[PDB]
Design a protein around this ligand. Structure first.
Ligand SMILES: [Zn+2]
Ligand SMILES: [Zn+2]
Ligand SMILES: [Zn+2]
Ligand SMILES: [Zn+2]
Ligand SMILES: [Zn+2]
Ligand SMILES: [Zn+2]
Lengths: 259, 259, 259, 259, 259, 259
């Protein structure tokens, strides 16, 4: 009904700020100049410029975010096509949202909303790679062809491969082709309740968080962090019956500020 | 034959109490004002006002409780429709029943009855989420559709997924869609015999209990608690032959009073 | 050929005892009055009244015992039908048999006979529940019906579920319905050779024993016990090939006297 | 061609011995009187009475031994049919054979011959039970019948169950019926090189041995034993490809003398 | 469009160097004389002689390198056909590239490019062998033929064997024939951040590197090394669903200089 | 083209040696007299008498060795037919070849050649047995027959069993029949770099070697040995995809000289 791309682009270009300057235009400039790949937009700024947009961001997130990103990417190549063939996705990273929840108080009604948590980062894995699109090769004498996997969809956390080959239509052996697989940087990090928040006698609760892409290694153990992201439930052996039915919560991280 | 809703509603509205006041009317007021989502009704009060109702509560529980909850919900929206779109279920939490069983004395004739156990809470997990309705997506080129799973029925503790797709009627791969899955807050807690009750020379017995929704984190290790709920047998690998046949008992907790 | 029910019933009603009283009639009275669910009959008494019956008891046990139990149940309901709908099986617990075997001396020819072992109880699990009759639900759009499982037969220690559904005849997913499942109280305990019986230099041998129903918690670690029951071999992953073929012995306990 | 039963029976009845007495007649008498279930025959005695027989024993063993046993059993029931319904197999246990091999020196050419080893017993398991004939029950609505398993053959160490039901001829679920399964007492024991035989600098080699039936618990850790039996190769996960191909040697024990 | 073989060959033959000598011609001479099997070419030299080629090397690597290698092999056999039947592939090892990345700074956009890392070798496995071409035998009464496996393609790190036999066309058991298998020398080593580069408080990150063929054993633990090669993701149980989707990075090493 | 048997036989009979004696004729005499079953021929002697033969031995080994063994066996039975029915194969064990490789220097160009390694034996397993021909029995009511397995071929290190029964041609369950299985004596031994050869600062490398038949227990931990044999790659889980592709090297030992 109403194009949020336009409003977003207008927002970045028009929004004044504190000293009648052009925050965001300036920010995007620093972004192109350094081939960094994320734009940090301050929430209160959006709401101020437009509440319809602010609303979407908090409540729609999953869809709108990629729309806004797609728009930003376009805007950038329009300023510097050289950015292409270096960076291919951009990331709109929302910060400073009113939605601050103490870690202990997270409940069911918070899954799927964009929220913020304040804690101490106590653990981070080394940087690893997640597949977001695979290439398989159908090992079968009559096919032997390659194809991108989850077609028009991203690979789920769990990793799946086709039953039936979409090039020949027959079942069989499929081999992953890593050199043709698209990867995204990935890091698991554990955050815990700040000491001040821990009811006496009790041990601090933790929350697994996932940092991807340029978010990776953006803070270290001991740091105090505001992490902003969307909560979800995490899986290892799903689709298998056996038992479970009970899930841990983790945050897919959208933005992070340190100390 | 006899509408318990009416009697329950009448009960809440007519029952006087100790000071010729209207306990329950007052309670429900405090419930709306604070958007809390449980009503605590004292058992002895019910029995007093009506023994037919009391009986049902202890012996029918599984069905009747939701009847009473449905009635309560109705009564509340009738006072304040704003309660809608904040809370959608209410939980009627019964307290103070005459049915107090010493943990060590629990036997098979007790499974399925609403009972009460007094003990010391020695362990609590952090809060997790239990699926009570999933959405799967049939990964199959010919379908690729979504559906709520256990249809007209809640998900078992164990987690199952269909063999045959209710949308296309064919078998295959099913993927869980968490963003569309209904979740309820969940916590396992271990409760143990009160020292006064442990026969000398022997080790205290323990009992796993499950706290769901707003019961979650309502007490902490070291607290003395009266937990009221329904006993059941707990599973990890069921439907699987191999061995077992022997099950642990746990309490599905209905209400909890602290220290 | 010869009805043991009659003889048993006659035995309980006629057998005099030490003071020309009616032990057994008296015992059964105490049984009804207290809703206890086991009758203890002294072996030497039986043999005395009838050797044919005594013989069966020791050597036929597996079948005859339930005959005798069936008979006792009938007799009881004939005195007080109120016993129904409280207790539904009875338990004839035989005591003081001449067949006392040293734990270390048990051999294959002993499996399946009613025997007695004298030892020190060293471990007891808490009380769990065994399934003796399940209810499954055939998860299938076309059926979705319930049925009691092992039909006209008890559940084996191992837990099985049907291949083919006896309501619709087709195969598929079956889900256990605990609230409709029959349960029996269950306790594993370990018993070990009396120090007096352990040859010097060597470690005491042990024997797993199972206590069901009202035998549960009838003795504690450190107690000296005479357990009377039937030996059998114990299973965890059977029907599976792989290896095994070698089994542990355990006693299914019929009666127990402490210290 | 030549009936070894006759010769064996004649041997036991005729063989004089040292003081013109009837060793063996005497031995078998002590056997019936005590319901013991093994006859110890001295090798040198056999060879002396008949070398054709002696030869068979050492070289044919596997078959001839059961022939000799079958003959002995017959001979015994002929003296005392009461022995029936107590003992059903007997065991001819050969002792004092010329074939003494040092444990370290066992090689391929010794597998399948009856040999003797002298060592120190360093380990024995508790007594367990091996299945030598199973009873399965075909769990299938159309059959539901029982049958003895390996038909006209003993169960291999490994434990197998039928693919196709020999009562109905269809495949499916088969459940073991323990109460109807024939068992044999079983004990694994480890024997090692005597210190005097151990080349200096090197650690003692061991040999797993299996003791069945009345051989069980016939010696304890620390004992010096001459064990006489047939060597074989031992399996856990056989029939499965994967790897292995390399096997340990164990002795199926035929007789044992202590210290 | 433009033959890099010619340019490469021209490069090696024409490129002068520092003293108007013919570095490369000289290098290749030393290569033939000693039956060494790798030519080290200095990057800055290439760029200088031709930037189009330099570009390919850094950015195309995966394809171009084998082109260049093929070309070098031809050139060599043209000077000394005796080199055949000793060495069959050559290895063009590129050194001194401008693309030096800090180990901790590696990201997804780096996978697949030829890069250099500077670190401390902390671990090396012994030398093992990798299969690059297998020979299987189709164990089948009707075939029983041999064939080289991945046809016209190298063996993936993971090892696969055909579904369908390319000699008979039918499926079945395939057995590896090592004596007919092509092997390459292989060594896993771990490399870690230089102390100078490890931010205070934090633990050094590490990187798995693989050394093949004549690179094997070319450095030892404690050595400071500049490794140049291509990053890739590493696999152990891939093609299997279950979970993962998350991968470690390792470098497939093209050249290495010590301390 | 040229019969090596003749040359070998001539070699053994004509070759003089150091004192114009007949080394080898003498050796073979000592072989018959003691029913030992290996002949040790010194390499340099062969080369001296005939270089064509020497060449074959080093480079053809796999075939030629058994040719030479067959010839030797013939020659022996011709001197003493009594050697038959004691020994049925002879093993020609070559010693003192010029091909001595330092353990650390072993590379892929060495696999498949007969080589020599000098080292310290640090570990030996006890003696075990390797199948070189199995007998399976097709467990199937319609067959139930026995057959030698790998037909006209030795069992791979890995152990396989047929998919289709060569007796009836149908698939199913196969059971190994050890009493009818051919076995060869087997010992794994670990050999390590001589201290003099270990580069300072680094850890000694090791090499698994396999001793079969009469080589078994021919040396003990701490012995310095020259082992001569053929290198190969070793397997545990092969034919299985998953990963690997990387293999350890081991020596299949042909001869061993101690200290
Ligand atoms: Zn295909
Ligand atoms: Zn579908
Ligand atoms: Zn059904
Ligand atoms: Zn059947
Ligand atoms: Zn084929
Ligand atoms: Zn067959």
């Amino acid at each position: 009904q109403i194009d949020y791309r336009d409003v977003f682009i207008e927002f970045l270009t028009t929004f004044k700020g504190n000293n009648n300057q052009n925050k965001y235009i300036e920010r995007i400039n620093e972004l192109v100049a350094y081939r960094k790949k994320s734009l940090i937009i301050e929430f209160s700024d959006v709401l101020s410029f437009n509440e319809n947009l602010a609303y979407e961001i908090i409540n729609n997130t999953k869809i709108i975010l990629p729309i806004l990103e797609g728009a930003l990417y376009d805007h950038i190549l329009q300023l510097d096509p050289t950015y292409q063939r270096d960076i291919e996705k951009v990331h709109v990273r929302i910060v400073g949202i009113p939605r601050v929840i103490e870690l202990r108080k997270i409940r069911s009604t918070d899954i799927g909303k964009l929220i913020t948590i304040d804690g101490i980062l106590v653990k981070v894995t080394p940087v690893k790679e997640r597949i977001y699109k695979a290439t398989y090769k159908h090992i079968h004498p009559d096919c032997m062809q390659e194809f991108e996997w989850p077609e028009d969809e991203e690979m789920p956390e769990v990793l799946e491969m086709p039953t039936i080959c979409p090039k020949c239509g027959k079942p069989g052996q499929f081999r992953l082709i890593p050199e043709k697989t698209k990867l995204i940087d990935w890091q698991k990090a554990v955050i815990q309740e700040r000491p001040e928040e821990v009811p006496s006698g009790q041990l601090p609760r933790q929350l697994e968080i996932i940092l991807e892409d340029d978010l990776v290694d953006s803070a270290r153990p001991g740091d105090r962090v505001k992490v902003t992201g969307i909560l979800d439930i995490k899986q290892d052996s799903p689709v298998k019956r056996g038992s479970r039915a009970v899930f841990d919560i983790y945050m897919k991280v959208s933005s992070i500020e340190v100390s």
